[PDB]
Every structure is written in structure tokens, then in C-alpha cells.
Design a protein around this motif. Structure first.
Motif, PDB file in Angstrom:
ATOM      1  N   UNK A  11       0.842  -1.187   0.000  1.00  0.00           N
ATOM      2  CA  UNK A  11       0.000   0.000   0.000  1.00  0.00           C
ATOM      3  C   UNK A  11       0.885   1.246   0.000  1.00  0.00           C
ATOM      4  N   UNK A  12       0.268   2.397  -0.270  1.00  0.00           N
ATOM      5  CA  UNK A  12       0.943   3.685  -0.237  1.00  0.00           C
ATOM      6  C   UNK A  12       0.010   4.697   0.401  1.00  0.00           C
ATOM      7  N   UNK A  13       0.585   5.659   1.138  1.00  0.00           N
ATOM      8  CA  UNK A  13      -0.183   6.735   1.761  1.00  0.00           C
ATOM      9  C   UNK A  13       0.465   8.053   1.365  1.00  0.00           C
ATOM     10  N   UNK A  14      -0.360   9.080   1.174  1.00  0.00           N
ATOM     11  CA  UNK A  14       0.117  10.421   0.854  1.00  0.00           C
ATOM     12  C   UNK A  14      -0.043  11.286   2.096  1.00  0.00           C
ATOM     13  N   UNK A  15       1.035  11.942   2.523  1.00  0.00           N
ATOM     14  CA  UNK A  15       1.021  12.751   3.738  1.00  0.00           C
ATOM     15  C   UNK A  15       1.337  14.198   3.376  1.00  0.00           C
ATOM     16  N   UNK A  16       0.556  15.130   3.925  1.00  0.00           N
ATOM     17  CA  UNK A  16       0.813  16.538   3.649  1.00  0.00           C
ATOM     18  C   UNK A  16       2.262  16.871   3.976  1.00  0.00           C
ATOM     19  N   UNK A  17       2.819  17.829   3.229  1.00  0.00           N
ATOM     20  CA  UNK A  17       4.192  18.234   3.501  1.00  0.00           C
ATOM     21  C   UNK A  17       4.277  19.076   4.774  1.00  0.00           C
ATOM     22  N   UNK A  18       3.196  19.769   5.135  1.00  0.00           N
ATOM     23  CA  UNK A  18       3.145  20.607   6.324  1.00  0.00           C
ATOM     24  C   UNK A  18       1.928  20.262   7.167  1.00  0.00           C
ATOM     25  N   UNK A  32      -7.148  -0.619  -3.168  1.00  0.00           N
ATOM     26  CA  UNK A  32      -7.945  -1.203  -4.244  1.00  0.00           C
ATOM     27  C   UNK A  32      -8.600   0.010  -4.915  1.00  0.00           C
ATOM     28  N   UNK A  33      -9.914   0.080  -5.044  1.00  0.00           N
ATOM     29  CA  UNK A  33     -10.482   1.296  -5.626  1.00  0.00           C
ATOM     30  C   UNK A  33     -10.941   2.314  -4.587  1.00  0.00           C
ATOM     31  N   UNK A  34     -10.748   2.051  -3.303  1.00  0.00           N
ATOM     32  CA  UNK A  34     -11.397   2.842  -2.266  1.00  0.00           C
ATOM     33  C   UNK A  34     -10.505   4.003  -1.859  1.00  0.00           C
ATOM     34  N   UNK A  54     -18.335   0.100  -1.402  1.00  0.00           N
ATOM     35  CA  UNK A  54     -19.532   0.414  -2.177  1.00  0.00           C
ATOM     36  C   UNK A  54     -20.797  -0.125  -1.513  1.00  0.00           C
ATOM     37  N   UNK A  55     -20.676  -1.157  -0.678  1.00  0.00           N
ATOM     38  CA  UNK A  55     -21.814  -1.747   0.012  1.00  0.00           C
ATOM     39  C   UNK A  55     -22.032  -1.173   1.405  1.00  0.00           C
ATOM     40  N   UNK A  56     -21.375  -0.057   1.735  1.00  0.00           N
ATOM     41  CA  UNK A  56     -21.461   0.718   2.982  1.00  0.00           C
ATOM     42  C   UNK A  56     -20.651   0.135   4.139  1.00  0.00           C
ATOM     43  N   UNK A  57     -19.945  -0.978   3.953  1.00  0.00           N
ATOM     44  CA  UNK A  57     -19.047  -1.472   4.994  1.00  0.00           C
ATOM     45  C   UNK A  57     -17.993  -0.417   5.310  1.00  0.00           C
TER      46      UNK A  57
END
Length: 246
Positions: A11-18, A32-34, A54-57
């Protein structure tokens, strides 16, 4: 703008620079697509992100302080009870679990760092169930209780039993219902070397080593029954274990 951070579990996460006025960082991830989002106390990609299926889980991704571990959870649409949980540990092994309505685990798949797996299915409220170990080239089948996993290979009158205790220790035993002392196999387990030594008619015949790499090797003794000969051979298919039990 934002900094990309690499995570266990592919996985990958994007973190604000500040940080923001509260000192907190924004987190964004696509799993995945979420699209998942959250806010964090730290600046390195760690913290909690949330989204929905998409199924509200409900979906939650929890990244440990040092980025060593990730937990990806799916919940009921009210967020109350678990549906599934996947944990990638710092050695990059993983445990993937499913749960029934009460939030009790009904399936647990362990993928070791080397890719071999323990597959536990039909898990009951007492921690019992069916067990499979997926090795390179073959599979071992057995059961699970809360005391141990027991995986069984049968050949002739011989039963080979690979035990994996609740704490993870391995031990191996062999039982033969042949009662003719010429042919009956007996065996002794050496926990220090993870080695099962098989004996027939008061002479050692074979050493079966259950290695730390989660493989099995077999090595014959000389006809004198006292020293090993040749070199150990790595088992690659279930037939070769059965052959060793002949």
C-alpha cells in the motif's frame, strides 16, 4: 504539497508536507479502488485512515508509529463488528482473518515472509478447526485445536504427525501399527536440531529435518545404522515424504 510513503502490505499513503493549525497532518490513501482519508499526529505517513466500501461497509487503515506494521479492517455498515482484518507485520508476514456475526474469528490465513502459509478454516468458538500448511511444492493437511496444529501424512501402517504448538514450537512424531520387529518404524525427535530420526529393526535409517526455512530434508544412514551417508535431499512433493515413510 504531499509526500508519498511506502507501506507494508503493498500500500501507499500520501502525507501533507506541512501540518495544519492544530499541528496535524492530512493522510490520503487509495486501497484497491477505495479512497481513504484521515488526520495524524505525526508527519511520516503513520496514523489512521477511514473510508467505506460500495456496500457501505466501514474500512479503516491503521499504520503503526514507525511504519513497521499496517492493519486493514472492514466492519459492518455501523462500524460495530469486524468483518475482516489483515495485518502485515514488520517482517512482512501477514495474518488475514474473517469473522462471523458475533465478531469471532472463523478463518485465519498466515502468510510467512517466505510465502509459505498456514490456512485455518471452519474455526469454532473454542479455537478448533481445519488446518492446512502450504509449502513450496506440496501441502500438509490436519486439524487445529487451541493446544496445537497437527498435520498428518499417512503411508502404509505409518502415520507422520507434524505438531505446531500454540506458541509456535514444532515437534514431529511417527507411529506405526505394524507389529513385526523386522519392518516396524519407530522414531525419536531432537528438538535442538528439529530432526526426526527413524529406526527400523534397531538401526537408524533416515533423518528427516524440518528446517527453519519451512522445508523438509531427508538423509539416509549407512547400512551400519550409525553414521549418515551422502547428503540431505530437500523434499519437493508430497510423494517424497510418503517415500521416506516406506
Amino acid at each position: 504539497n504531499s509526500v508519498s510513503v511506502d507501506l507494508p502490505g503493498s500500500m501507499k499513503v500520501l502525507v501533507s508536507k506541512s501540518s495544519n493549525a492544530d499541528g496535524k497532518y492530512d493522510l490520503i490513501a487509495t486501497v484497491d479502488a477505495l479512497e481513504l482519508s484521515g488526520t495524524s499526529d505525526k508527519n511520516n505517513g503513520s496514523g489512521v485512515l477511514e473510508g467505506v466500501k460500495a456496500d457501505a461497509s466501514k474500512v479503516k487503515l491503521t499504520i503503526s508509529d514507525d511504519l513497521g506494521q499496517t492493519t486493514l479492517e472492514v466492519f459492518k455498515s455501523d462500524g460495530s463488528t469486524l468483518v475482516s482484518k489483515k495485518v502485515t507485520s514488520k517482517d512482512k508476514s501477514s495474518t488475514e482473518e474473517k469473522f462471523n456475526e458475533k465478531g469471532e474469528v472463523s478463518e485465519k490465513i498466515i502468510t510467512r515472509a517466505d510465502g509459505t502459509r498456514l490456512e485455518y478454516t471452519g474455526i469454532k468458538s473454542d479455537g478448533s478447526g481445519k488446518a492446512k500448511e502450504v509449502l513450496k511444492g506440496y501441502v500438509l493437511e490436519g486439524t487445529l485445536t487451541a493446544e496445537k496444529t497437527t498435520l498428518v501424512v499417512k503411508e502404509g501402517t505409518v502415520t507422520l504427525s507434524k505438531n505446531i504448538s500454540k506458541s509456535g514450537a514444532v515437534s514431529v512424531e511417527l507411529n506405526d501399527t505394524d507389529s513385526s520387529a523386522a519392518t516396524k518404524k519407530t522414531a525419536a525427535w531432537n528438538s535442538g536440531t528439529s530432526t526426526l530420526t527413524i529406526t527400523v529393526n534397531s538401526k537408524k535409517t533416515k533423518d528427516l529435518v524440518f528446517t527453519s526455512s519451512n522445508t523438509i530434508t531427508v538423509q539416509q544412514y549407512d547400512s551400519n545404522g550409525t553414521s549418515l551417508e551422502g547428503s540431505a535431499v530437500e523434499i519437493t512433493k508430497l510423494d517424497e515424504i510418503k517415500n521416506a515413510l516406506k
